[PDB]
Structures are given as C-alpha cells and as structure tokens.
C-alpha cells in the first residue's frame, strides 16, 4: 500500500489577518517598553508582505519558515519593538548583550519566529534603551523604572 490524495481539512475561518496594524504602525515602541499584541482568529497568509517589505532576518526556532503554511496555531503573541541594526543578532535564545540582558530576554524553551527588517527612513528621531540595570531580566519580562539606581 502507498498513500494517495489529500484530506487536508482546516477550520472555517474567513478573517484576513491585520498585518498592517502590527507591522506598519506610525511609530514602533521603545525596546525597554515593548508592546505585546495577542493575535487571534485570523489566517497566516505571509504573502501580502512579499511586496514592498524586505525581510532582513526571518529565523524560526522550533518550527520552520517552510512549514508555516501547513500549521494552525492555538494562540499567537507578537512582541513588537525597534532597535539598532547591529543589535538584531542578540534576539535569540541563550544570548547576552544589552537588549538580551537589560531590555528583552527570550526563554530557553522558545518556539517562535524572530522577524526583523531594516527601516532607516520611516522612523526618524530619538529613542531610549536601558543599559545600567543591576540584575538581568527574567525571560519575557518588562521594566519601566527610569531611576531605579
């Protein structure tokens, strides 16, 4: 015996998913005050972003970017922020730096996708980052104390 045909059956969901209100906000938040948006009841097309958005880093841990079509997620959260161009390499499990110690730590049992793109023309101005914390953060934690020292 050998398999034949496909019995692919996915849930009857008709909503298209708000990528423009999570990837193209007017201004992304600071790294020390990163926002988390719960994404629910939508379809993960990943193909409306193939035009006019050049993805500088798309690294998935636990799953693969070639298999994101075939999977339906129980729940998705999106942590969104904006950093320097050389500090993108610090967003990975098991790593230390400024962003990975004092602003945003990722857990060791991570199962997700880090997606970062360079944009030096959309966001012009000045941003803030934490660099003098006494104790390193626990994973997926936030700190807003400006004068804790």
């Amino acid at each position: 015996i050998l398999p034949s045909t496909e019995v692919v059956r996915f849930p009857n969901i008709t909503n298209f998913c708000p990528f423009d209100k999570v990837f193209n906000a007017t201004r992304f938040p600071n790294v020390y005050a990163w926002q988390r948006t719960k994404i629910s009841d939508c379809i993960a097309d990943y193909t409306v972003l193939y035009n006019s958005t050049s993805f500088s880093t798309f690294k998935c841990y636990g799953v693969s970017p070639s298999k994101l079509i075939d999977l339906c997620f129980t729940s998705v959260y999106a942590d969104t922020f904006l950093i320097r161009f050389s500090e993108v390499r610090q967003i990975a499990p098991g790593e230390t730096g400024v962003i990975a110690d004092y602003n945003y730590k990722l857990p060791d049992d991570f199962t997700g996708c880090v997606l970062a793109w360079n944009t030096a023309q959309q966001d012009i101005g000045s941003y803030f980052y934490r660099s003098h914390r006494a104790v390193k953060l626990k994973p997926f934690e936030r700190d807003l104390s400006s004068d804790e020292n």
Binding site: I1, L2, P3, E6, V7, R9, F10, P11, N12, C72
Partner: protein, 192 residues
C-alpha cells in the same frame, strides 16, 4: 489509504467514522505508545478513527523459490470475510486481488489462509502455520493445508489379570549429534 493534514497534524491512514469520547476542547486522541488514533475534523465536527491503512499481521507461507515459487497468505487476528475491508483492495494491485478474495479461503483459529485447500487426512507438519494447523507441498502443483497428526490412535487391552511378555528382541544403533564449539572469531580495534 490517504495522507491527511488535520490542523497541522500530518499523518497517513484510513479514516473511519467512530464514536470515541472526546471533550469540548480535544482535537486528537493519544493511544498505545503516544499515537494519534482518534481525531476531530474542524469542519462538520465529528470523531474519525485513524486505522493503519493496511494490515501488518500478514504472514507468507512458501516452499523454496528454487522449488515451486508458489505462495500462500495468512491473515491473523481477524476473520476472512473482513479481509477485503482490512486489506483495502480498492488501492492494491490486481495480482493481490486474487489472494484478498478467492476460491481457496480457509478460516482457522489463527485467521484465514488463502492459497491452500483442506484435506481431511492428516500428515506430518512441514511448515508450522500455528494453532494446530499445518501446510505442506508434498501433499499436481499446489500447497496443501491440514491439521497435525499427533499420532496413530492405539489401544491396549488392560484385562486385569493378563500380561504380555516379549519372546524375541533386536539390537539397533541410534545416532545423536551434539555441537561442541563454534568458530573462534576475533575482531580488531584497528582496520574495523
């Protein structure tokens, strides 16, 4: 026998309508040693059992291929009427369809045997089928199947006052063969 992708649960098997007990939040069922055996389709929500898409309990009885190249098929743990349902002859080849359902089916204790016919007279066991039945090739060109002859049924007249006494004897030489050693094989660290 189909490949299915149920909510990202890729697998291969035969889906059958089943009535397993699931909760309101369960999407797949774990069975045996963590195998997805009962699932729930997302559209028109019901319970589907994933049977394996053929039968693993299939034995092949043959003489040597230098002798006959003739084959017999044994299906265990199942009747022989549901052999087309378990084997699934909608997808298997045409030469398999003779052995799936034929004129020479035989139900026994260990399933059914296809390719051999029953003779009432019993001989010595050549190929051990199991559960008391046996098959042979000596039996104008077919595999024969029978039950084991445990021996010729004898009777002794215990007459409560009579003995039987031997009056003549014989001497015979019997041969017994016993192994003593095997070849002394030594392997090396280098060159292996």
């Amino acid at each position: 026998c189909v490949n299915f992708n149920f909510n990202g649960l890729r697998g291969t098997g035969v889906l059958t309508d089943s009535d397993k007990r699931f909760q309101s939040f369960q999407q797949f069922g774990r069975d045996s040693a963590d195998f997805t055996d009962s699932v729930r389709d997302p559209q028109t929500l019901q319970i589907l059992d994933i049977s394996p898409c053929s039968f693993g309990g299939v034995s092949v009885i043959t003489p040597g291929t230098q002798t006959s190249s003739k084959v017999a098929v044994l299906y265990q743990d199942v009747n022989c009427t549901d052999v087309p349902t378990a084997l699934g002859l909608d997808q298997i080849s045409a030469a398999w369809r003779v052995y799936a359902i034929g004129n020479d089916v035989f139900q026994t204790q260990a399933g059914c045997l296809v390719g051999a016919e029953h003779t009432n007279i019993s001989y010595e066991c050549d190929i051990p089928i199991g559960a008391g039945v046996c098959a042979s090739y000596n039996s104008t060109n077919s595999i024969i199947a029978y039950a084991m002859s445990i021996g010729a049924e004898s009777s002794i007249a215990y007459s409560n006052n009579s003995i039987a006494i031997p009056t003549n004897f014989s001497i015979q030489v019997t041969t017994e063969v016993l192994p003593v050693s095997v070849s002394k094989t030594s392997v090396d660290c280098t060159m292996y």
